[PDB]
């Protein structure tokens, strides 16, 4: 029965509870990257990268 | 029975609770980046990197 | 019954409960990488690297 | 200026964020009260009782 | 300026993040009573009783 | 300037966190009184008793 797996659960998020409260939030960047905010997020690969909140400047 | 493998769990958040509570967040960058506010984040890669909030400045 | 492994976990994170509460927070980045506030993060790699809170300021 | 009183808050709930996630609840009673599953609740009374979740069984 | 009273507060509840997370919950009363799962109640009275979570069982 | 009084607070909770995590919870009463699970409660009461999570069997 090769592979008789039952309920795995791979890349799962599940049961988050978030309360963000701020005045004055502010973000300003100048030829750069910025990533912020990022909340319950899976994912699941298969011969590849994986990257999630990635954030790069420059490529040359 | 090759691999009968019952409920595994692979990358996985569950049950996260959160309250942030700024007053004046602020960010400002120049030419680089910037990664914040990362929360409650599941991945699983077969055969491949597996950054998550990764931050790279240049690359040449 | 070869791998007859039951209910394994691998890169689990449950259970977190978390209170940011600042007044000013503020991040000022020039030219380089910054990575703040990762908070409940799961992840599974095979077969390559396994990087989350990463940061690099040049790559030549 | 008798009472110039400006933004007052009184009996005030704001922000609040929840996750409930069972696989079987279940309530049985005979004769008597119950309450459950009270949320985000407020009031303002003047000259008079204010309960909220209350249970009485009997009165005679 | 009698009362030039600002910003009070008063009966305030703001800013709660919760997550309940049973597999087989159960009550079960008989002539009595029961109270549970309250969450983020406020309340303001005057000139009267206040209870929020009360539970009494008989009144002779 | 009687009572010029700026931002007061009186009963208030602000920034709760939480995660309850059961398999089996049960409550079984038999005549008497039960409060469980009260969480984030806020109350201001003027002339008048203040009871919050009470519990009382009989009262004769
Ligand atoms: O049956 C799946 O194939 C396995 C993975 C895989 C792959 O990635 C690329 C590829 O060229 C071949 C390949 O054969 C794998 C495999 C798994 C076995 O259990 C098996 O008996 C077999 O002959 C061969 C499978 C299903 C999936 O759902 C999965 O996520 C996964 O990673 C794999
Ligand atoms: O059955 C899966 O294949 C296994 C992994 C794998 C792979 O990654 C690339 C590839 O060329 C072949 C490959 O064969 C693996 C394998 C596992 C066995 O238990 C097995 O009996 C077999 O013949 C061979 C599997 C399923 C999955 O769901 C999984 O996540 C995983 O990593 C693997
Ligand atoms: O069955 C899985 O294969 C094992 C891992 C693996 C791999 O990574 C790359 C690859 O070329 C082959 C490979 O064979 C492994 C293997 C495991 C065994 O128990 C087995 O009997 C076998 O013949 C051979 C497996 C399933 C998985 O879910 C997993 O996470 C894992 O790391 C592995
Ligand atoms: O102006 C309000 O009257 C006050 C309360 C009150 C009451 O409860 C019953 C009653 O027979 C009389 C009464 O006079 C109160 C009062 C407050 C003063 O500041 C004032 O100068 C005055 O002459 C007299 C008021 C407004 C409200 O919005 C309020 O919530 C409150 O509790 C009260
Ligand atoms: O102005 C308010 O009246 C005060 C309370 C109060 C009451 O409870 C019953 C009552 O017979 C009279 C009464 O006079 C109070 C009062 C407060 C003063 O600052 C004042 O100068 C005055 O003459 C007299 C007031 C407003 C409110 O909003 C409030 O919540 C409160 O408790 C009170
Ligand atoms: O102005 C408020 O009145 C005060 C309380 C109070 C009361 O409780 C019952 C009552 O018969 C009279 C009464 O006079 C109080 C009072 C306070 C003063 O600062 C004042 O100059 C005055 O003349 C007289 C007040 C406002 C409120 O918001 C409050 O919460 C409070 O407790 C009180």
Request: proline fraction near 0%.
């Amino acid at each position: 029965v090769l592979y008789v797996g039952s309920k795995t659960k791979e890349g799962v998020v599940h049961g988050v509870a978030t309360v963000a409260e701020k005045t004055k939030e502010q973000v300003t960047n100048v030829g750069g990257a910025v990533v912020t905010g990022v909340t319950a997020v899976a994912q699941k690969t298969v011969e590849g990268a994986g990257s999630i909140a990635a954030a790069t400047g420059f490529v040359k």
